[PDB]
């Protein structure tokens, strides 16, 4: 059937949708279709085509109050690693507290981890029951499942600037040095290539 209302969604609303590039963009919800127990959401992007998307592939174009965000919440967030900026999907890993200076830690679908603010987060409309299940990458998906379910039990390695460790990159281990520590993240300097990366302190990419 064709719907005009579906839960709190209404045809003609402005929303975010996931493009095939896996980045997220502003669009209009132009239709809502049901096929038995299934729902699909037609979005016309502002500078793009149309696509027919599952409800886990659209997000509200507002920032939610903090009490609607849990560890495991499915979100779209401003993705920034120094070399690129996008809106990209992820899972909330930490909510604001003293130890993270009142920020949200996001585990993005591609394995990147970053701290963002409340004003950089958007809630996905129709997340799956097990929110991580639409993470395409099996390694990333499984790590997030384990993390979210084990939380607040979080194995992490305690690291200090100057510390020498091995870090994984491209499937092998590299001589590296802790450059900076920020909450549950560490900035690792790969010594041979002289480049840095932010990595979660509980990542299995860290040899310890």
């Amino acid at each position: 059937e064709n719907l005009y209302f579906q839960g709190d969604l209404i045809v003609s609303m402005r929303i975010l949708g996931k493009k095939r590039t896996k980045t997220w963009h502003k669009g209009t919800l132009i239709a809502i279709q049901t096929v038995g127990p299934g729902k699909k959401y037609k979005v016309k992007f502002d500078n793009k085509g149309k696509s027919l998307l599952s409800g886990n592939h659209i997000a509200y174009d507002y920032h939610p109050p903090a009490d609607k965000l849990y560890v495991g919440s499915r979100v779209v967030a401003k993705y920034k690693d120094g070399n690129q900026v996008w809106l990209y999907a992820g899972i909330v890993a930490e909510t604001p507290n003293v130890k993270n200076k009142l920020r949200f830690l996001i585990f993005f679908d591609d394995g990147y981890a970053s701290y963002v603010t409340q004003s950089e987060l958007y809630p996905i409309c129709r997340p799956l029951k097990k929110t991580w299940e639409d993470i395409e990458d099996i390694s990333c998906r499984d790590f997030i499942e384990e993390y979210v379910t084990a939380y607040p039990n979080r194995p992490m390695v305690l690291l200090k600037s100057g510390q020498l460790i091995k870090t994984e990159w491209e499937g092998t281990w590299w001589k590296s040095r802790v450059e900076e520590v920020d909450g549950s993240l560490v900035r690792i300097l790969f010594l041979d290539d002289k480049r840095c990366e932010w990595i979660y302190r509980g990542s299995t990419r860290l040899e310890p």
Side-chain angles (χ1 to χ4, degrees), residues 5-10 39 41 54-60 74 123-129 134:
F5 305 85
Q6 192 291 291
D8 64 1
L9 286 168
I10 306 168
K39 298 161 175 64
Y41 301 86
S54 58
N56 55 315
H57 290 159
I58 50 165
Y60 300 106
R74 205 66 170 102
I124 275 155
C125 299
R126 299 292 178 259
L128 299 179
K129 179 166 174 177
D134 57 4

Side-chain angles (χ1 to χ4, degrees), residues 167-169 174-177 188-197 199 205:
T167 308
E168 182 278 343
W169 186 73
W174 302 74
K175 294 196 172 175
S176 77
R177 187 170 60 220
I188 298 297
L189 169 65
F190 287 87
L191 291 164
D192 250 294
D193 295 341
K194 304 181 190 176
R195 51 156 194 104
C196 288
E197 192 170 353
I199 301 176
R205 288 184 68 201

